[PDB]
Amino acid sequence: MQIFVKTLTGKTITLEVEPSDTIENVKAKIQDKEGIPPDQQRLIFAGKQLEDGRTLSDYNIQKESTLHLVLRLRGG
């Protein structure tokens, strides 16, 4: 399956995933493609901040869906 992850700038990252892939797995793929730590990553879908332990299928994220990458830095 294939989903898209959009960055502030507008860059779109395309990832090959499975409906059962957790958000944790996706953050791992984002660290591979963006060099950003899963702890620093924040994923948004339909205005909801996703939880790492839930799978894409748990959030009804279908083929071609777009997620938004937000940054969460410990203290700044």
> Position of tokens 């507008």?
10
Binding to its own copies by CB under 8 A, coded x per residue (else -) over 40-69, reads x-x-x-xxxxxx--x---xxx-------xx
- Amino acid of residue 21: D
- Amino acid of residue 42: R
Q: Which lies closer to its own copies via its Cβ, residue 2 or residue 49?
A: 49
State the Cα angle at 13 between 10 and 14, rounded to 5°.
135
Q: Which lies closer to its own copies via its Cβ, residue 63 or residue 72?
A: 72
Min dist. Cβ of residue 33 to its own copies (A): 8
